[PDB]
A paper describes a structure:
Streptococcus pneumoniae scavenges essential zinc ions from the host during colonization and infection. This is achieved by the ATP-binding cassette transporter, AdcCB, and two solute-binding proteins (SBPs), AdcA and AdcAII.
In this study, we investigated the Zn(II)-binding mechanism of AdcAII by mutating each of the four Zn(II)-coordinating residues in the SBP. Quantitative in vitro metal-binding assays combined with affinity determination and phenotypic growth assays revealed that each of the four Zn(II)-coordinating residues contributes to metal binding by AdcAII. Intriguingly, the phenotypic growth impact of the mutant adcAII alleles was, in general, independent of affinity, suggesting that the Zn(II)-bound conformation of the SBP is crucial for efficacious metal uptake. Taken together, these data demonstrate the importance of SBP-metal complex conformation for bacterial Zn(II) uptake.
Numbering used by the authors: 28 to 59, 65 to 128, 133 to 255, 259 to 305
Write the structure that this text describes.
Amino acid sequence: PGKGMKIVTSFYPIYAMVKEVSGDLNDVRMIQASFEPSANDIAAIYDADVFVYHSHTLESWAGSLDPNLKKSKVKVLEASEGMTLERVPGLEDVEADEKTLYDPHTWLDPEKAGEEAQIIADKLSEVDSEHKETYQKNAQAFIKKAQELTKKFQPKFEKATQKTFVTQHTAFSYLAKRFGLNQLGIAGISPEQEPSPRQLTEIQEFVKTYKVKTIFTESSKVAETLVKSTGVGLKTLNPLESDPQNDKTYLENLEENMSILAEELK
Ligand SMILES: [Cl-]
Ligand SMILES: [Cl-]
Ligand code: NA
Ligand SMILES: [Zn+2]
Ligand SMILES: [Zn+2]
Ligand SMILES: [Zn+2]
Ligand SMILES: [Zn+2]
Ligand SMILES: [Zn+2]
Ligand SMILES: [Zn+2]
Ligand SMILES: [Zn+2]
Ligand SMILES: [Zn+2]
Ligand SMILES: [Zn+2]
Ligand SMILES: [Zn+2]
Ligand SMILES: [Zn+2]
């Protein structure tokens, strides 16, 4: 190993949490909603030492990887293995295609983000046991700063008179459950899931019922159709599914969106 292990990550939260757990160690990079990585990414995955993805409920293509058939030494790691996933909003009481029932957007909960960084540190310690104390020490520093981020915004959401907000797609369910908030997504779990006409009417009644004055968009066009039907304002709220391309850490990018949400709910 020149720079250490060659680690490849699925998307931005996994790339950020692996990079901060590894720290100075290894060579961490990220492959280039729709998902389906290119032909070169899968080739780069089989040429790497470690590949880390979030969950089978998100990167469904990760389950088709067969390192034994391709004669590859890549060790695929599911960063959220063992974490308890909540039901998809609107499907809580469904008894059971089944992958559509569980919500994967846990990285937006500061507590569950630290839980995923610990699993990454544990799984990296099972592959690279010599540096196990560096992975755990970097993870505990990430968990500590995440738990302090939760303690900081917990009183900020308790005093909020408005605890209901609407976002571009159903991605902030874990964040709302962390601070006792209520949320509704225009689109479903995936941004491609366009609302049906009957569902759009429910979003209209939902905004009117709980006096929602703001729809949080992403940096879609169905959201621009309801700004006339509801008269709400538009503010940005990044679910951190794409790289913000800045010089902030993951928890700093997460805190920024939390501060945008907390100032609006007051
Ligand atoms: Cl329920
Ligand atoms: Cl998604
Ligand atoms: Na509900
Ligand atoms: Zn799994
Ligand atoms: Zn539960
Ligand atoms: Zn229920
Ligand atoms: Zn039954
Ligand atoms: Zn090492
Ligand atoms: Zn070393
Ligand atoms: Zn601190
Ligand atoms: Zn999403
Ligand atoms: Zn900084
Ligand atoms: Zn801070
Ligand atoms: Zn401010």
